[PDB]
């Protein structure tokens, strides 16, 4: 329904091994379309989706420029972080930043994203109002003084509400066939032995898109949460996703359990039982 464009930056320092690595990946919803790796022989923005390859040289060159600037900036960010937390120059550290825009149904910015972490923990994040910052600790508040002083939030809001949404719309149009699609999952229930008096009912949903999906179990109409196991939604590698949810059920009680699937590709939510 509503769409989004998100960029993911990862900067990894490595003392005694030269410059830090900087990867940037672009996503429209659950589909990657651009990459940039400083550890490539010839660093440059590359296409990872077919609907972006037809972009003019200007696009790729400028994107490469921005990527390089970001890389340098984050290389500085790592040292700065070393100074803020008073850390040694020997350890390896990581900075991650996710930022993007949720294009709402009204065609306006439903939600804006700009959040970063240090060594896997919240650092600083742009708030919902897109005017204020939330700093995780006293070290991030330095950066906060900095970004408030330069009115960074205003600029970034300008980006999110404008260029971000616009490029998102363009991407949605050029890749309409693969981006604006809702593929329902192929579902099925399997039985597995566990105990002399117990078994496992595994509910399968395969080849669906987008990733968002709801897989549940019910016992005679009443939701069932105990003895359940729902694996993290996984990629098929072909632009689809997979997911299964299992339940441990006493032998002879199989018929009393049902699996419920919700996905935007389904006209109506599914109800499944184990079939001979």
């Amino acid at each position: 329904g509503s769409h989004s464009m998100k960029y993911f930056y990862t900067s990894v320092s490595r003392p005694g091994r030269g410059e830090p690595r900087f990867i940037s990946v672009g996503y429209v919803d659950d589909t990657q379309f651009v990459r940039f790796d400083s550890d490539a022989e010839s660093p440059r923005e590359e296409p990872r989706a077919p609907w972006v390859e037809q972009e003019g040289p200007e696009y790729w060159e400028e994107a490469t420029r921005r990527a390089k600037e970001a890389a340098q900036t984050h290389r500085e960010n790592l040292r700065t972080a070393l100074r803020y937390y008073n850390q040694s120059e020997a350890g390896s550290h990581t900075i991650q930043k996710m930022y993007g825009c949720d294009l709402g149904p009204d065609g306006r910015l439903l939600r804006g994203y700009h959040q970063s972490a240090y060594d896997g923990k919240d650092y600083i994040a742009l708030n919902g109002d897109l005017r204020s910052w939330t700093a995780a600790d006293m070290a991030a508040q330095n950066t906060q003084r900095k970004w408030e002083g330069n009115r960074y939030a205003e600029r970034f809001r300008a980006y999110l509400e404008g260029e971000c949404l616009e490029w998102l719309r363009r991407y949605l149009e050029n890749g309409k066939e693969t981006l604006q699609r809702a593929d329902p999952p192929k579902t099925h229930v399997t039985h597995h032995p566990v105990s002399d008096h117990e078994a496992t009912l595994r509910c399968w949903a395969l080849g669906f898109y987008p990733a968002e999906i709801t897989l549940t179990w019910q016992r005679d109409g009443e939701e069932q949460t105990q003895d359940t196991e729902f694996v993290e939604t996984r990629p098929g590698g072909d632009g689809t996703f997979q997911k299964w949810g299992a339940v441990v059920v006493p032998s002879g009680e199989e018929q009393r359990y049902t699996c419920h699937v919700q996905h935007e590709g389904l006209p109506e939510p599914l109800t499944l039982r184990w079939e001979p």
Partner: peptide, 9 residues
């Protein structure tokens, strides 16, 4: 496309 703005820490 990525953002033009990326202020230092």
């Amino acid at each position: 496309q990525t953002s033009q703005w990326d202020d230092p820490w």
